[PDB]
Design a protein around this ligand. Structure first.
Ligand SMILES: Nc1nc2c(ncn2[C@@H]2O[C@H](COP(=O)(O)OP(=O)(O)OP(=O)(O)O)[C@@H](O)[C@H]2O)c(=O)[nH]1
Ligand SMILES: Nc1nc2c(ncn2[C@@H]2O[C@H](COP(=O)(O)OP(=O)(O)O)[C@@H](O)[C@H]2O)c(=O)[nH]1
Ligand SMILES: Nc1nc2c(ncn2[C@@H]2O[C@H](COP(=O)(O)OP(=O)(O)O)[C@@H](O)[C@H]2O)c(=O)[nH]1
Lengths: 431, 50, 617, 430, 431
């Protein structure tokens, strides 16, 4: 009865949202038609968090799809679960943003943002009680980042108290897809710091590394990365949708994770990720899940936690498990790796337990870590942004859309200040 | 097959049962009783012959 | 002597588990997959059925030859064999042991001359076999790990140099042109174009060049075979597709099933707008669609274990049979009533059946988080079942087919942080109390009037399977995994006994006389025990080819049945042993069973879901 | 005549209330439907004209999931639908959220239903408030409800069976924060507050019940057994009857000092049961053992001020006198120099009933030892530095401030806990 | 509950280990799919010594396969019991050592040894209690001897107190497979003397002789020799896995066998080895087993014990047997052959009895003899090594992989010192 309004932005955001809705519908026993075929009461017990009931048994996701080019949402509609979404929630332009954050935030996003907020308000007002909004999108893409930041600002203005969760695909460290990735990322992080209450950083190269090393897949397409992202997106909110031995909502996670308001960026990971060869040969135990969870390779962010210090870390476990086992495992991890954990917080673990594991898995566990390791991710993005901005390469594309040059400096200053805060709490000493 | 593995119908062979029995005193006592009865029967037969 | 009366089984997970035999004037109008074997039966129930059994593990693919042959495929065991069955012979015709892993799919040519068999793992091969002798083409390779979902053959383009086989593997469609004269296979991947859907069923048009693929998105994707590209997509039946059949006559029509039970008639022509309107709704999820009774019925199957007959002239719906889905764990008989049989399952479903006609008297359903119904006890107006969560739920027995109402429940009857799930429920003679056995070895006697606990009795340290109450305020357990069984007393004080064997037990029954107790061990040994004796009276070694899993007992104390993993149920005299009658009909290991209160009648269940009814005379 | 109104606030309160009410129904013979096939149920249940018994309980929570689990589970026909009160938004482990913004209307409705329930009671021995110190719902809403109860009801004895954060192991991060806030709140409202630690009860389950994987169900079952042993004298007659009013008279020397350590004995599984005599003296010694204590607080560090023993079953005053004499003569057990007797023994003829599905065995004797000791200052000493360590950096302070709190509230709570520490030191010292 | 970590090295070691795991799985009733189909409580009672429980009923062997060429592991995986092993336990390189101890110990063994120790540590930390490690490999081969000695040294460094048991296939006297067998053997024996707590010498020619004379097998495959070795390897530890009337673990055997730390080499043999023709004709009695056991032809080492003197000898009997009968047989053997037993040890026999015989056999007995006869085998290896090293033939490969020439001299000196110790205790007189 605590609703969540999902929004997808850009091509990457739309694909991630489509995969996520596919996974959630599979978990609730919802076929691409909206009808329930799950044969379990708990599946329909809290289905109203994500879905609304149609005239019949049809369940329409509370999802809103954004784009400036129609091809991405044509593909979304033609995908496996394209028919669950209400057609009125597909908001499309005609000319896509040319990987231009300025186009997606100022020129072309301005016209479509009115319709986007209208659809968002219509979806929110139908909700009994609203936990908040989750926005899935990519940093380093024009329409995605631009419209996502603009919409997040608008929703922050309209609903300050309601939670804002963001799944942002930060541009990858080593292999960059588009040239203007540093510009878009720098502009978008400035908005996410100020507006987004809770933000998750995802890197495609970290996803490739985890799917090639742990899953040991040979040809991982974007579908597999979207599947892992969808798994994390489901697991963070499964406590809302299912009974929990120690349940924890998004606001509880944010309260126990965010020490200071600006330091709300988190690296996330899902367990157990097992290769097909070793699926039988592994054993699903709480210690095994914790061991795989605290591995740096499990992180979906490029930054490895070993360099930084864990400010906080929430672990949402799913399945019939011992709370004593969970608490003992996480306390043992903290004691063993006390060097990697902040001293002035006696307990850096927020453990939650949910009664319903994901389909196919006896046990699971999603991890949300707030650590100063993300400082190096921001530092690298700034290291590229400064190099480009010194010679003002591609600057005219953003300048001609009507945003001042001083905005680049302001965004860079804000992002460097965030880096400074992360370093300060990395090397802060107790007393 | 494995050369160490005894063939069926051999003095070395034992089924899966009679293995994991782990009872030596009872088997020896039963064999002793059987041998005593057989020896008594043999003596009876020899007595009859004489 | 055991006589098989009826087998109720259907692999509801498979798409196309049941299928008609076209133009079948003789017996055996339908063929169903239930497990290791194939149930070849007549369209009308209460008729003899044959059991095509030549496999070792579950069946992964079932194919008809459009009248003339059946085919079932194996799974694992290094013997994933493609076995061809003949309608008239009812015997295996060809045995292709060329797939190292389970055969993903199998299909027959529209002219019943070629045979397509596709594996997926470590050797992904599109074997094409001729009806005479063996194979025609080795393979085309595919790729390991690509789950070949379904396959179909083109009715057209049968010039001897071409045979268009459509194969749906995950979200991939491939058209395979096969030259059987030269034995070559060319595989063209269909250009999807943002069309990513999981295809449940495939079917070509009558004239070809149009392949209809039903998807889980309730859509039929029409693809141009000539261009090997997705041409269009239309929604057909909300819920999914399941089974897709060509219309019996049609203009361009195509009958579509749905997971909602809807049956509609999708035609490629008719514009982009459909406005779905089913002509028939069956209870459950449609997975099979065919035509039989001289093409007068539609013979629609269900994922819920149901087979239904839909008339074509008047759309009349008549059920044929129902199959309990999952691993069936216990069989119960009403204390005095032989007409009602209760069968439980690891799935949260219990079926009370009328043994006269094998119809579903009533159904008990519980959510999956409530464990599985691991033991059952039937009453004149109640069904008491012990589940995998340790709870004992008693439901109001209904009639005519309906979801039963849960009258009450003993909560946490057997769940002690080391073993959950009560097994081997028993009722007191005449009805005074309820004996229950936990997964850890605790026996518990429960009052029936007040549902209060009356005795907790914890000496056995492992799973209880085969508890039984004597004729007077006493009871006894079986205690698997600790190779001992003890007769107890309701005054919370063990009365001696505690007889230990040498191998772990699996079931225990008590005869009509209060002194005879039969146990069955994993050593495939049946042990007879006298309560007055410290040692078992005798033991029969190698009762079954594999481990024995369940034992029964007639209420007269004359005979007791024994079912094991050999899929064969035998009958043994209580005192003299020997085989009164034995037969193998379940397509799985036999998990539980129950004698009828009267002389005639034995009802056994298997791990696959097969319930076999037996006449003892 | 001896009605006691039960309040269960937060997930922990409700999840221990499930065990408590299962135990009460099993003890009184009440079926989960609501009716039984006397007047000893009047303490916990009120009977209707139809014969159906409803518990005098109130399940308060700001999260719908926990209460809906009860509404759908086994005891859906037993509890009153309006008595189960559910909020719309969880407190999110924020004491400010659960005490200032969300909890207002919920607690007002709770007072409404509590007044309605008290209207059905001729007498009223008191309230049994079961909450969780360390969570926004339990701490904030529980504190607000206790304040309202103190304001309106007045002198009614409110026994708070609080669950406090464990020393090292925990599940929350702002747990020290809202724990200190809740302690400051309830220092002046509850009459007798019983401390419970999950770490201590986990150790009890591991060592005594041999459960290598204890869970909240086991913890709540143990707590329910303790509370049933506490209330047994209200429902069942026995020699040396002890009352709710007699607790705080025989256990509280000074109003500030009202926190109680609780120890149940024996704690044995069925397998290990009936292997030892389990005599009165042995079970008393086990109850006074530090390991059996349900709080991670070694009594050897402090000195016992009072000890109330509640015996259940085949217990004779001669045996209890011998056992208590041995305990007094024991050197390890140390009482304060200013309390010569320090003992309140009370026997009951009703043995504790065994919950089916519990790990506790059927024992003919049971002891619930509830003690006031100055050692309990140790847990406050731990929370007082776990609090100020974060408070130096003002971590998570913005969350609490956002829901209508001030830094002054944190300072006041910390100073009040320091005053509690100094009071404990003063009473302990000669 | 006293776990043992098995390690296979080289082609010969991998084949022997595969056969050994097949034998143990058969003895515990484990099918090649890992499920338990053994039909006995005692089989599952102590299955944790060699196996771990998977997700279901599957049991994963605690084995680690190590090699530099993937062909042997591919063959083992394709073999009948190739699917029980955890795929993560297959550590292989890419270029095999060309029968070069230098390549297997310094150049190529260095890189793979990190992964090997990682797998070993992961396996060992999972063990509740660790009896130790058993390493099966062949002296006289590049990858086998190389990483065998390297890993044995590393495991000795990591776990000093834990037991080390080795099954080394010493190059055979008369027929030599590769040319550089004496070089590899000389380099490996020096390592085993320092590191291995307990070492078991096996010779292919001794195995051929025993299977051609006792078994009367005319053309014995390597599988037959591997299966005899597997029977010995099972019987040495069956006292850990099964209840015994007088049980004796690996440490008890080592204590009762090794008089002085450097004299830890043993020759072993298995009984009863019967030819198929005489199987009905042979009657199994403890005296018959002992008569076959003390025969020199029964020893799996080429050295015959008649030349040397038995320092110590342990015999692990298996089956329902009389302790009086066993003890009387061993005492009578000592009295009859007192000339072959060392005088300054009053009882040179450590007799152990286990109540569980192997599959198919009513009774069995595995023998482990520490006698000075091993002197002649090491003497022969030195006779070949010195002949080759005088002219420095094939020395340039070992030199170019980066060991000083002085390593050969030091290894030869160590082997000669071991020979001297064996001769000293052969001709030592009491008082
Ligand atoms: N002893 C015991 N403690 C519990 C149990 N369940 C939860 N707790 C404790 O209760 C604390 C939080 O309780 P609650 O405040 O009710 O949690 P909630 O219902 O989500 O409400 P908020 O956390 O305030 O938003 C946790 O820190 C746990 O330590 C239980 O079953 N037994
Ligand atoms: N994980 C994932 N990442 C994607 C996907 N599609 C695109 N991306 C990444 O998202 C980044 C930005 O592209 P995007 O924002 O979608 O382009 P836009 O929609 O025009 O703004 C690119 O660098 C891609 O690598 C997808 O399906 N999954
Ligand atoms: N008993 C036995 N001996 C073998 C087997 N395979 C090889 N050998 C012998 O072991 C010796 C060493 O070879 P090996 O170490 O396996 O070669 P590497 O793996 O390249 O180092 C050779 O001389 C072979 O004669 C086998 O399967 N069984």
């Amino acid at each position: 009865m605590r609703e969540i309004v999902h929004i997808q932005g850009g091509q990457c955001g739309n694909q991630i949202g489509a995969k996520f809705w596919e996974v959630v519908s599979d978990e609730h026993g919802i076929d691409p038609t909206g009808t329930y075929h799950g044969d379990s009461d708990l599946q329909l017990e809290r289905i109203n968090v994500y879905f609304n009931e149609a005239t019949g048994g049809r369940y329409v996701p509370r999802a809103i799809l954004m784009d400036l080019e129609p091809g991405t949402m044509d593909s979304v509609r033609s995908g496996p679960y394209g028919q669950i979404f209400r057609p009125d929630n597909f908001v499309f332009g005609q000319t896509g943003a040319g990987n231009n954050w300025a186009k997606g935030h100022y020129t072309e996003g301005a016209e479509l943002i009115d319709s986007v907020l209208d659809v968002v308000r219509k979806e929110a007002e139908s909700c009994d009680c609203l936990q908040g909004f989750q926005v899935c999108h990519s940093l380093g893409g024009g329409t995605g980042s631009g419209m996502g930041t603009l919409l997040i600002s608008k929703i922050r203005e309209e609903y300050p108290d309601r939670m804002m969760l963001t799944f942002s695909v930060v541009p990858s460290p080593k292999v960059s897809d588009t040239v203007v990735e540093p510009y878009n990322a720098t502009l978008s992080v400035h908005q996410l710091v100020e507006n987004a209450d809770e933000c998750m950083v995802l890197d495609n190269e970290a996803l490739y590394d985890i799917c090639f090393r742990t899953l040991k897949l040979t040809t991982p397409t974007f579908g597999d990365l979207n599947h892992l992202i969808s798994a994390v997106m489901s697991g963070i909110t499964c406590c809302l949708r299912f009974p929990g031995q120690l349940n924890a909502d998004l606001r509880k996670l944010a309260v126990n994770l965010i020490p200071f308001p600006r330091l709300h960026f988190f690296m996330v990971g899902f367990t157990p990720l097992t290769s097909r060869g070793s699926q039988q040969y592994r054993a699903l135990t709480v210690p095994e899940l914790t061991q795989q969870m605290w591995d740096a390779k499990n992180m979906m962010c490029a930054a490895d936690p070993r360099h930084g210090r864990y400010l906080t870390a929430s672990a949402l476990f799913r399945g019939r498990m011992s709370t004593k086992e969970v608490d003992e495992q996480m306390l043992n991890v903290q004691n063993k790796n006390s060097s990697y954990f902040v001293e002035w917080i006696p307990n850096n673990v927020k453990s939650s337990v949910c009664d319903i594991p994901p389909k196919g898995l006896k046990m699971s566990a999603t991890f949300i870590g707030n650590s100063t390791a993300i400082q190096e991710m921001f530092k690298r993005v700034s290291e590229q942004f400064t190099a480009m901005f010194r010679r003002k390469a591609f600057l005219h594309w953003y300048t001609g859309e009507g945003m001042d040059e001083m905005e680049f400096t302001e965004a860079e200053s804000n992002m460097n200040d965030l880096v400074s805060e992360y370093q300060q709490y990395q090397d802060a000493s107790a007393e | 097959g494995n050369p160490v593995m005894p063939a069926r119908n051999a003095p070395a062979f034992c089924d899966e049962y009679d293995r994991f029995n782990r009872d030596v005193a009872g088997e020896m006592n039963a064999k002793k009783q059987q041998n005593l009865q057989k020896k008594e029967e043999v003596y009876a037969v020899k007595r009859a012959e004489q | 002597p055991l006589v098989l009366r009826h087998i109720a089984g259907l692999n509801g997970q498979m798409f196309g588990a049941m299928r008609s035999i076209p133009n079948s004037r003789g017996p055996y109008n339908i063929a169903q997959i239930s497990g290791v074997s194939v149930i070849l039966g007549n369209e009308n129930n209460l008729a003899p059925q044959f059991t095509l059994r030549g496999h070792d593990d579950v069946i992964t693919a079932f194919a008809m030859s459009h009248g003339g042959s059946m085919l079932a495929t194996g799974q694992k065991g290094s013997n994933s064999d493609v076995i061809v069955w003949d309608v008239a012979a009812c015997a295996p015709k060809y045995k292709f042991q060329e797939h190292d892993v389970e055969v993903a799919t199998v299909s027959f040519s529209a002219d019943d001359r070629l045979l397509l068999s596709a594996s997926c793992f470590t050797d992904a091969k599109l074997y094409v076999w001729d009806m005479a002798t063996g194979k025609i083409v080795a393979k085309h390779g595919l790729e390991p790990g690509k789950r070949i979902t379904c396959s179909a053959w083109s009715p057209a383009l049968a010039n001897g140099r071409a045979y268009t086989c459509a194969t749906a593997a995950g979200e991939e469609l491939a058209l395979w042109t096969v030259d059987p004269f030269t034995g070559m296979v060319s595989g063209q991947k269909v250009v999807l174009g943002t069309v990513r859907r999981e295809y449940t069923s495939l079917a070509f048009s009558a004239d070809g060049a149009w392949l209809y693929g039903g998807t889980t998105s309730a859509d039929v994707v029409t693809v141009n075979v000539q261009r090997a590209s997705v041409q269009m997509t239309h929604p057909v039946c909300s819920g999914g597709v399941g089974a897709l059949l060509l219309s019996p006559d049609g203009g361009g029509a195509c009958l579509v099933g749905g997971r909602d039970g809807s049956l509609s008639t999708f035609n490629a022509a008719g514009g982009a707008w459909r406005e779905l309107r089913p002509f028939a709704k069956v209870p459950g999820c449609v997975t099979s669609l065919s035509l039989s009774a001289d093409g007068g019925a539609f013979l629609v199957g269900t994922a819920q274990g149901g087979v239904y007959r839909l008339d074509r002239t008047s759309l009349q719906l008549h059920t044929i049979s129902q199959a309990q889905q999952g691993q069936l764990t216990a069989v119960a008989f009403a204390p005095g009533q032989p007409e009602a049989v209760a069968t439980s399952s690891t799935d949260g479903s219990i079926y009370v059946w009328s043994t006269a006609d094998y119809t579903l008297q009533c159904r008990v359903q519980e959510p999956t988080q409530a464990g599985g119904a691991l033991c059952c006890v039937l009453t004149r107006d109640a069904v008491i079942s012990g589940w995998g969560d340790g709870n004992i739920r008693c439901h109001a027995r209904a009639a005519g087919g309906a979801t039963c109402a849960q009258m009450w429940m003993i909560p946490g009857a057997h769940a002690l942080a080391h073993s959950v799930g009560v097994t081997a429920l028993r009722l007191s003679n005449g009805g005074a109390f309820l004996l229950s056995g936990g997964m850890g070895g605790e026996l518990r006697v429960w009052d029936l009037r007040s549902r209060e606990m009356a005795a907790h009795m914890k000496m056995h340290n492992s799973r209880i399977v085969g508890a039984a109450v004597m004729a007077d305020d006493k009871h006894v357990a079986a205690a698997s995994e600790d190779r001992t069984w003890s007769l107890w007393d309701v005054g919370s004080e063990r009365v001696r006994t505690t007889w230990r064997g040498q191998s772990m037990f699996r079931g225990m029954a008590v005869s009509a006389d209060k002194v005879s107790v039969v146990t069955v061990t994993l050593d495939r040994k049946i042990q007879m025990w006298d309560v007055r004796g410290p040692d078992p009276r005798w033991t029969k070694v190698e009762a079954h080819g594999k481990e024995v899993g369940c034992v029964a007992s007639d209420h007269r104390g004359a005979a007791f049945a024994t079912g094991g993993a050999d899929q064969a149920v035998r009958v043994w005299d209580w005192r003299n042993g020997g085989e009164v009658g034995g037969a193998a009909c379940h397509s799985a290991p036999v998990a539980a069973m129950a004698f009828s209160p009267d002389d005639a009648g034995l009802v056994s269940v298997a791990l696959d879901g097969s319930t076999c009814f037996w006449q003892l005379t | 005549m001896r009605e006691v109104i039960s309040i269960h606030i937060g997930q922990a309160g409700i999840q221990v209330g499930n065990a408590c009410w299962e135990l009460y129904c099993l003890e009184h013979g009440i079926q989960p439907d609501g009716q039984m096939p006397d007047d000893a149920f009047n303490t916990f249940f009120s009977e209707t004209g139809a014969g159906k018994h409803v518990p005098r309980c109130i399940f308060l929570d700001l999260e719908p999931t926990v209460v809906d689990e009860v509404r759908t589970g086994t005891y859906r026909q037993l509890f009153h639908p309006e008595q189960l009160i559910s909020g719309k938004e969880d407190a999110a482990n924020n004491f400010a959220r659960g005490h200032y913004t969300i909890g207002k209307e919920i607690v007002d409705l709770a007072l409404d239903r509590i007044r309605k329930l008290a209207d059905n009671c001729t007498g009223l021995q008191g309230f049994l408030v079961f909450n969780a110190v360390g969570g926004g719902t339990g701490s904030g809403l529980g504190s607000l409800l206790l304040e309202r109860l103190s304001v309106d009801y007045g002198k009614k004895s409110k026994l708070g069976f609080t669950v406090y954060p464990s020393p090292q192991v925990s599940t929350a991060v702002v747990e020290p924060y809202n724990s200190v806030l809740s302690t400051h709140s309830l220092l002046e409202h509850t009459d007798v507050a019983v401390m419970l630690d999950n770490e201590a009860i986990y150790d009890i389950c591991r060592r005594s019940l041999d459960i290598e994987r204890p869970t909240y169900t086991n913890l709540n079952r143990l707590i329910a057994q303790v509370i049933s042993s506490l209330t047994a004298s209200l429902r069942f007659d026995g020699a040396l009857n002890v009352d709710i009013t007699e607790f705080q008279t025989n256990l509280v020397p000074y109003p500030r000092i009202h926190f109680m350590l609780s120890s149940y004995a024996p704690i044995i599984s069925a397998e290990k049961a009936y292997h030892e005599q389990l005599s009165v003296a042995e079970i008393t010694n086990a109850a006074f053992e530090p390991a059996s204590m349900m709080v991670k607080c070694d009594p050897r560090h402090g000195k016992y001020m009072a000890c109330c023993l509640m015996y259940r079953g085949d217990v004779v005053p001669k045996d209890v006198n011998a056992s208590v004499a041995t305990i007094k003569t024991k050197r390890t057990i140390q009482f304060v120099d200013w309390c010569p007797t320090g003992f309140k023994c009370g026997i009951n003829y009703q043995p504790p009933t065994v919950v089916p599905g519990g790990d506790l065995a059927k024992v003919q004797r049971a002891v619930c030892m509830i003690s006031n000791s100055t050692a309990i200052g140790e847990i406050f000493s731990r929370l007082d530095h776990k609090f100020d360590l974060m408070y130096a950096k003002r971590a998570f302070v913005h969350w609490y401030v956002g829901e209508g709190m001030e830094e002054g509230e944190f300072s006041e709570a910390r100073e009040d806990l320091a005053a509690l520490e100094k009071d404990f030191e003063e009473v302990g010292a000669e």
